[PDB]
Design a binder for this molecule. Structure first.
Ligand SMILES: C[C@@H]1O[C@H](O)[C@@H](O)[C@H](O)[C@@H]1O
Ligand SMILES: [Ca+2]
Ligand SMILES: [Ca+2]
Ligand SMILES: [Mg+2]
Ligand SMILES: [Mg+2]
Ligand SMILES: [Mg+2]
Ligand SMILES: [Mg+2]
Length: 505
């Protein structure tokens, strides 16, 4: 007995929200799906991934950019391809700062680089382009610093000593740089960053250094969080118990099949457990802290551009990433590295554009909305307009279908209106109110009766589940979603699609 949108005159209160829900930044990020990384600095000019061997070489010797950095082209290409954020490596492990910093001489200002206006600040250049195009930004600022004298415990002359005798505190230097960037209107999207990357990767032989994470976080939020007047705190990557965007746990762009946007944290001990399973952090159904699962990956073989590492991944490789990250309730943070001329190689740009074009065309035509198609459900919450099945195909994340209290599971019938070719089924849970769905099943058949053929079954939906299969023909698709006793499922959007040739499995 399938229920449509007609004659729903009932009423009901909204389903209770989960205890653990995303803040406004986390929610926005999960719905954006696509973010870009930009690795650029001395490594770009020295055919290396970790700049461990620069020694006492001057900025002019290691950062040799002549041409005006082309921020415009990069940002425009990324925006056109559907990327909604750019995370910039302001400082990598080598310590070289690509903004004009008063707190070090190891920066772009000291290098000799100057744009058309004689200014020397790559971060400012990227920020201007992001602001012009309304591209949000993240800030990567390496905690491990190979160059900065204050890193580690040293006396006035540079001899190693105990923490109590340390003459210059690295925590103050790092904090000052956060304040310098975050506090200045010329950095960020109209002064704003939504994410700070403080990844803890560190050379096995590097000196000990304790980080004053609490001090750093306050500085971040005083400039970019609620304390600064924003609607959410700035998201933090690599911040232990204060993490709000977690590492997916590999660099392949692959999230586990059943990925939860929640971790277990202990703010007393400053620990975090995000449930490592195989090569991915799959999170916890009963996690106490929302963490956005962020799958970082390289479009080329390295993070930095180089003459041996400038071949972009194929559409097959990139489509695999997309379906296994975005399709598994994770974001995809794809690195697109500038070259030693300060632009991006044509082949790389073109692959980015191609990837974007393929995503757009794959999801252009929602077959559940075709003429003669219909979406119905096994039950509507209170028989009320507010939870009608049409809420799953209105391109509105704020509207959802749900069942009545006491019904923890429901079915969705998509009738395509005729025998129809497809290979992608898309399901989106209303995660603004929590991630709670713990079983799903997608089935199909020819005609309007007879046994169902299983496409895919699993646990989670979250921000987005994409079920990709080989080209299939069917008339009806049935989706089953359920949660635990005393809760009801909420689905904000569904769709059925045939992918482009270069996105097919
Ligand atoms: C995105 C990756 O973050 C890590 O901290 C670094 O060790 C890698 O070089 C790369 O920048
Ligand atoms: Ca020190
Ligand atoms: Ca909706
Ligand atoms: Mg969307
Ligand atoms: Mg420029
Ligand atoms: Mg300086
Ligand atoms: Mg700011």
């Amino acid at each position: 007995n399938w229920i449509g949108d007609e004659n729903l005159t009932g009423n009901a209160e909204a389903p209770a929200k989960d205890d653990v829900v995303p803040d406004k930044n986390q929610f926005r990020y999960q719905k954006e799906e696509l973010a870009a990384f930009c690795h650029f600095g001395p490594n770009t000019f020295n055919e290396i991934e970790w700049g461990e061997h620069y020694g006492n070489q001057k900025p002019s010797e290691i950062f040799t950019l002549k041409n005006d950095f082309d921020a415009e082209t990069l940002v425009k290409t990324l925006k056109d391809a559907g990327f909604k954020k750019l995370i910039v490596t302001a400082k990598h492990h080598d310590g070289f700062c690509i903004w004009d910093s008063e707190h070090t001489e190891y920066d772009v200002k000291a290098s000799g680089y100057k744009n058309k206006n004689g200014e020397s600040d790559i971060l400012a250049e990227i920020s201007k382009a992001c602001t012009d195009q309304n591209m949000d930004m993240g800030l990567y600022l390496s905690p491990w610093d190979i160059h900065e004298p204050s890193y580690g415990y040293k006396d006035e002359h540079g001899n190693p000593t105990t923490p109590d005798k340390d003459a210059k505190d690295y925590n103050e230097f790092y904090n000052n740089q956060l304040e310098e960037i975050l506090g200045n209107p010329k950095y960020g999207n109209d002064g704003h960053f939504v994410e700070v990357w403080m990844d803890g990767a560190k050379g096995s032989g590097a000196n000990a250094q304790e980080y004053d994470f609490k001090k750093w976080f306050k500085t971040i939020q005083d400039n970019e969080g609620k304390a600064a007047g924003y609607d959410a705190d700035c998201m933090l990557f690599g911040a232990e118990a204060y993490t709000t965007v977690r590492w997916i746990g590999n660099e392949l762009g692959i999230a586990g099949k059943d990925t939860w946007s929640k971790s277990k944290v202990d703010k007393d001990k400053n620990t975090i457990n995000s449930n490592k399973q195989g090569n991915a952090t799959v999170g916890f159904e009963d996690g106490d802290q929302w963490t956005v699962p962020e799958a970082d990956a390289r479009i080329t073989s390295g993070w930095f551009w180089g003459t041996k590492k400038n071949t972009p991944k194929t559409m097959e490789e990139l489509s695999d990433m997309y379906f296994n990250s975005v399709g598994h309730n994770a974001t995809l943070l794809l690195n697109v590295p500038p070259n030693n001329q300060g632009t991006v190689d044509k082949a790389i740009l073109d692959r980015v554009t191609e990837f974007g074009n393929n995503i757009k065309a794959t999801f252009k035509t929602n077959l559940a909305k075709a003429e003669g198609a219909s979406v119905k459900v096994s039950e509507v919450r209170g028989g009320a307009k507010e939870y009608k099945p049409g809420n799953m195909i209105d391109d509105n994340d704020e509207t959802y279908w749900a069942t009545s209290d006491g019904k923890k599971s429901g079915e969705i019938l998509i009738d395509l209106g005729k025998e129809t070719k497809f290979d992608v089924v898309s399901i989106e849970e209303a995660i603004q109110n929590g991630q709670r769905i713990n079983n799903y099943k997608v089935e199909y058949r020819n005609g309007d009766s007879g046994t169902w053929t299983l496409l895919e079954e699993g646990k989670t939906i979250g921000a987005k589940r994409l079920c990709r299969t080989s080209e299939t023909t069917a008339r009806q698709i049935k989706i089953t979603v359920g949660t635990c006793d005393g809760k009801v499922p909420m689905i904000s959007e569904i769709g059925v699609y045939k992918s482009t040739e270069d996105m097919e499995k």
